[PDB]
Structure 1
Amino acid sequence: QYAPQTQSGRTSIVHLFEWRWVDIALECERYLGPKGFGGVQVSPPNENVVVTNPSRPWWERYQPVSYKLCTRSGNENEFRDMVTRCNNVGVRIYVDAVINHMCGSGAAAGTGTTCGSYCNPGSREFPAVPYSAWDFNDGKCKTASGGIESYNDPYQVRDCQLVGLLDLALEKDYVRSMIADYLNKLIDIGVAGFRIDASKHMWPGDIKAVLDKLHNLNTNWFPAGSRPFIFQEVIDLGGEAIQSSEYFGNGRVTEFKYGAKLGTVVRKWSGEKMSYLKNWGEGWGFMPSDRALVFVDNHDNQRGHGAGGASILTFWDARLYKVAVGFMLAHPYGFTRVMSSYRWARNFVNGEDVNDWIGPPNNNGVIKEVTINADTTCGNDWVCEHRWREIRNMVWFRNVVDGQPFANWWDNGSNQVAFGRGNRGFIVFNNDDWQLSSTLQTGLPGGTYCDVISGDKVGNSCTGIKVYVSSDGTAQFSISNSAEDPFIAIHAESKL
């Protein structure tokens, strides 16, 4: 459950948020495969309710109406095609499994669904599954409203309705079986694992029950006896009754403390300095590395910060974001997930952004294709952070240093930091308001290396900065605080 099941040597997955199956299939072949990406986290592939007010928000996809593979991203054949094509080039697919609930109890009965299925939320009727009133937690919930009223009561958060969503009775074998059939169909298609949406709202034992019913992975691409990779979404910053540790037995858990802490440090807020990252990881009170799925920002928390005051870093703050993602990709803690977003219009109405709901780029509701420009960037409002040189080269860096221990840490007592990974990679950051000029021990074999942040190693030369490491492993570094990317990274494969 903890092993990602990626091909040999691939260490990261990217979230191609709201991408169509056909575009992901193409991306796998033309980029993700060649560039060493381990996998892709896809948006929920099952049928969801259509929300017209607001117009097709990203969150409508988290309100299931059936398990038919039919959404705005595509249909079942397109989904199968994508999984096959990606697997063939060594890029895995991880599905966002929405299994705690169906759609909102206040949803209109009808056929306003992505695949035309009929449902009557009011009477808890989902004939396309099928689910009936007795497959929900209405009678088990202890609150008068039927919704969660206190996060300090585990029974309320797990058995009551999460923001009005019909809560599935996951202790029933029938429900467990319906969900297992859905997940097994995906596994047989070739999916490598799942992101369990809203895990905090389900009992660890119930999730475990479903997981035990899952098949081993498709032997066409996976070794016999392989179990699906599992990462559960649990937001635990320490202020409540439910703890992330309760889910360690099912697989990995999202470590939300990671991005929040990192963001504060990189921004230099609350008296934090980069020199404090010396003991980053479990030292900061994070979960065990082998149970963690880490990331700088995710599809949900990258939104809602238009008015400032939030430490979360996103593509909106490109410079600081690249530094944070670079540090994450270089550090040995956890299994890393890279974010890939679409830009939306940040418009304010009385001091609050009103476009946090906006869905993917579209033409009258039909998701726009991802267009690739000559400079390898994307068009049609897809930001494609995974294509930024600095991020692209750092996921490669992570593959290269895979397994090497954290070593040769250095800091100037302020915001200039450096560390290596065994004898395969070294990275140095200058987050101070002054120049960095020092000779450091890199732990690397002597030679000339191309800095993979400012350029690439092309043929017999570097396109950007060159670092000269002497026979003793020491190298001179000069980083201006005015540099576009105030950090340098070198590894065994960027050596000339």
Structure 2
Amino acid sequence: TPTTFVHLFEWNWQDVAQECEQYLGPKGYAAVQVSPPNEHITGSQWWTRYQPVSYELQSRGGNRAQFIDMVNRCSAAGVDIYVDTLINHMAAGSGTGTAGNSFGNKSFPIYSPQDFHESCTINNSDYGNDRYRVQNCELVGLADLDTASNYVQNTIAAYINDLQAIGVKGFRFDASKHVAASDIQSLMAKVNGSPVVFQEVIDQGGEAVGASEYLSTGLVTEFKYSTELGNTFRNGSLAWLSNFGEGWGFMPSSSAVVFVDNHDNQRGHGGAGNVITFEDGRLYDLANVFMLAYPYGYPKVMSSYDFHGDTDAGGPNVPVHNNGNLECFASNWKCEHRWSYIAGGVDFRNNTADNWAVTNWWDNTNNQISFGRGSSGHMAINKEDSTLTATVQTDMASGQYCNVLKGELSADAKSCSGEVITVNSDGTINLNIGAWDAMAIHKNAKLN
């Protein structure tokens, strides 16, 4: 069952199409969050995508034809597309867009100065004590749309409905905290059908605008997940995670979109150093294995590029699929979604979707944990400096299974490509996990 999506940050439409066919579909990823496909300002920075000029499908990722081709090819491979949608603002200042359109002084091809709120700046202190300024003033100088205007709502809804007609199945509502929930409710009444919608709202507590306000209009990003997971994996004990989720004050599991990191927080855009990213190597593998095995939220795996310390820089000058060779894992695209522990975690989540309970939790009071998903699967993580050799109880059928974090079951189910894990006749497993390593097994990767 599809259970996880992925953010192919800055990947062009041709690369996404090929990836859907060659990897995402076969591996079981449910969908792909793509970078903003509408017309945006020129420039090489990754953030130019967040300054719209119009809603024409001409962007850094490609043209309208290439975008449509991607949606079709991905759909045929069984993978949905989620579009990052700018519902709060238009570009700052003046200039030119990727489709040749000019703009300036709050004047665009589709909006006039009268379609925006009067200019004011959102100050950092506004987040804590002024709801009005957070929602009516400008986020880093971006022209703030009058989202209460019938014309503005019709214009945004027309873009969304047009995308659905092409085949797009979901949408990320960027900067939702900056738009009144009531305005998003009015907008949704104009949107056809019931596409998947998730709203970006950063709420760690104490804000004038809370994430709970957006639960009726769609899923909401649970940022506490990313920060608490990073803080626990770096500075705490994994044993504390036995009740991760609602128990820690997070929103309902069925309303949350979760992640280890996202495109903003992995580069300091609102995210501290406690956030775990690809730069952390094995620590990132382990954080992802926990997230994907744990039954809370709808997770999205991150897929980045090595930015060489430049937090404003755009992606590599070479495509992912380059004349027969994959530009992954090195100093260009990182392709975390292809990392064996991460892809293995996705396979585990997909095959344990029939049991959402955490069963038989075990820990050493510190950094060694193990738990199962009933008889569907079992996992263990060792973050101590000595080998984990404890015997743990599982609800799984006795036999031999492939540790899916390190290999996979062959077509004839007579061998694995990685190490084999044995479930004894009494359901126990005698662990043998080295320092900073893990294992995951499920009922559909059992040897015959």
2:296 to 318, 328, 333: 333
Q: What letter corresponds to residue 71 of structure 1 in structure 2?
A: S
1:389 to 314, 331, 340: 340
| Matched ranges for 1:50-449 at <5 A | 50-51=42-43, 56-104=44-92, 107-108=93-94, 110=95, 112-120=96-104, 122=105, 124-127=106-109, 130-138=110-118, 146-149=120-123, 150-151=126-127, 152-216=129-193, 227-267=194-234, 269=235, 272-304=236-268, 310-346=273-309, 355-362=310-317, 368-371=319-322, 377=328, 381-404=332-355, 405-449=357-401
Output the TM-score relative to the length of structure 1.
0.86
Q: What letter corresponds to residue 290 of structure 1 in structure 2?
A: S
Q: Which residue number in structure 2 is paired with residue 351 of structure 1? A: none
- Using the alignment, how far apart are the partners of 1:295 and 1:213 within structure 2? 30
1:428-477 Cα offsets, whole Å, 9 max, x none, are 01112222111111211110011112222234212222111112211110
Give, in angstroms, the shift of residue 158 of structure 1: 0.3
Q: Does 1:26 align with 2:18?
A: yes
Give, in angstroms, the shift of residue 370 of structure 1: 3.5
Evaluate the alpha carbon distance shift between residue 87 and residue 468 of structure 1 in structure 2; reply closer, same or farther with a 3 A threshold: same
Give, in angstroms, the shift of residue 403 of structure 1: 3.0
SS at match of 2:360: strand
1:26-85 Cα offsets, whole Å, 9 max, x none, are 11111111111100000000000113xxxx111111000100000010011110111111
- Using the alignment, how far apart are the partners of 2:294 and 2:206 within structure 1? 27
The answer to whether the 8 Å contact 2:320/2:327 transfers is no
SS at match of 2:197: strand
Evaluate the alpha carbon distance shift between residue 274 and residue 90 of structure 1 in structure 2; reply closer, same or farther with a 3 A threshold: same
Give, in angstroms, the shift of residue 376 of structure 1: 9.5
SS at match of 1:358: coil
- Using the alignment, how far apart are the partners of 1:422 and 1:259 within structure 2? 26
Q: Which residue number in structure 2 is paired with residue 5 of structure 1? A: none
- Using the alignment, how far apart are the partners of 1:309 and 1:215 within structure 2? 39
- Using the alignment, how far apart are the partners of 2:6 and 2:233 within structure 1? 22
Evaluate the alpha carbon distance shift between residue 377 and residue 444 of structure 1 in structure 2; reply closer, same or farther with a 3 A threshold: farther
- Using the alignment, how far apart are the partners of 1:183 and 1:309 within structure 2? 33
Evaluate the alpha carbon distance shift between residue 380 and residue 80 of structure 1 in structure 2; reply closer, same or farther with a 3 A threshold: farther
Evaluate the alpha carbon distance shift between residue 378 and residue 411 of structure 1 in structure 2; reply closer, same or farther with a 3 A threshold: closer
- Using the alignment, how far apart are the partners of 1:248 and 1:371 within structure 2? 42
Give, in angstroms, the shift of residue 380 of structure 1: 7.2
Q: What letter corresponds to residue 117 of structure 2 in structure 1?
A: N
- Using the alignment, how far apart are the partners of 1:212 and 1:94 within structure 2? 19
2:421 to 467, 478, 492: 467
The answer to whether the 8 Å contact 1:48/1:66 transfers is yes
The answer to whether the 8 Å contact 2:303/2:336 transfers is yes
The answer to whether the 8 Å contact 1:370/1:382 transfers is no
SS at match of 2:20: helix
Give, in angstroms, the shift of residue 379 of structure 1: 6.5
Evaluate the alpha carbon distance shift between residue 100 and residue 376 of structure 1 in structure 2; reply closer, same or farther with a 3 A threshold: closer
Q: What letter corresponds to residue 32 of structure 2 in structure 1?
A: V
The answer to whether the 8 Å contact 1:339/1:385 transfers is yes
- Using the alignment, how far apart are the partners of 2:144 and 2:203 within structure 1? 21
Give, in angstroms, the shift of residue 113 of structure 1: 1.4
The answer to whether the 8 Å contact 1:456/1:463 transfers is yes
Q: What letter corresponds to residue 379 of structure 2 in structure 1?
A: I
The answer to whether the 8 Å contact 1:39/1:91 transfers is yes
SS at match of 2:288: helix
- Using the alignment, how far apart are the partners of 1:164 and 1:234 within structure 2? 19
Q: What letter corresponds to residue 132 of structure 1 in structure 2?
A: S
Give, in angstroms, the shift of residue 309 of structure 1: 7.0
1:220-248 Cα offsets, whole Å, 9 max, x none, are xxxxxxx1001000000113111100000
Give, in angstroms, the shift of residue 303 of structure 1: 0.7
- Using the alignment, how far apart are the partners of 1:229 and 1:462 within structure 2? 36
The answer to whether the 8 Å contact 1:15/1:42 transfers is yes
Give, in angstroms, the shift of residue 369 of structure 1: 4.3
The answer to whether the 8 Å contact 1:378/1:384 transfers is yes
- Using the alignment, how far apart are the partners of 1:161 and 1:176 within structure 2? 18
Q: What letter corresponds to residue 256 of structure 1 in structure 2?
A: F
- Using the alignment, how far apart are the partners of 2:263 and 2:76 within structure 1? 27
SS at match of 1:195: strand
Gaps of 5+ in 2: none
Q: What letter corresponds to residue 322 of structure 1 in structure 2?
A: D
Give, in angstroms, the shift of residue 137 of structure 1: 0.4
- Using the alignment, how far apart are the partners of 1:439 and 1:334 within structure 2? 29
The answer to whether the 8 Å contact 1:370/1:380 transfers is no
The answer to whether the 8 Å contact 2:320/2:326 transfers is no
1:166-185 Cα offsets, whole Å, 9 max, x none, are 00000010000000001100
- Using the alignment, how far apart are the partners of 1:170 and 1:245 within structure 2? 20
The answer to whether the 8 Å contact 1:376/1:387 transfers is no
Q: Which residue number in structure 1 is paired with residue 39 of structure 2? A: 47
Output the TM-score relative to the length of structure 2.
0.95
The answer to whether the 8 Å contact 1:451/1:464 transfers is yes
Q: What letter corresponds to residue 118 of structure 1 in structure 2?
A: S
Give, in angstroms, the shift of residue 374 of structure 1: 7.0
Structure with greater helix share of residues? 2
Q: What letter corresponds to residue 314 of structure 1 in structure 2?
A: T
SS at match of 1:296: coil
SS at match of 1:480: coil
Q: Which residue number in structure 2 is paired with residue 219 of structure 1? A: none
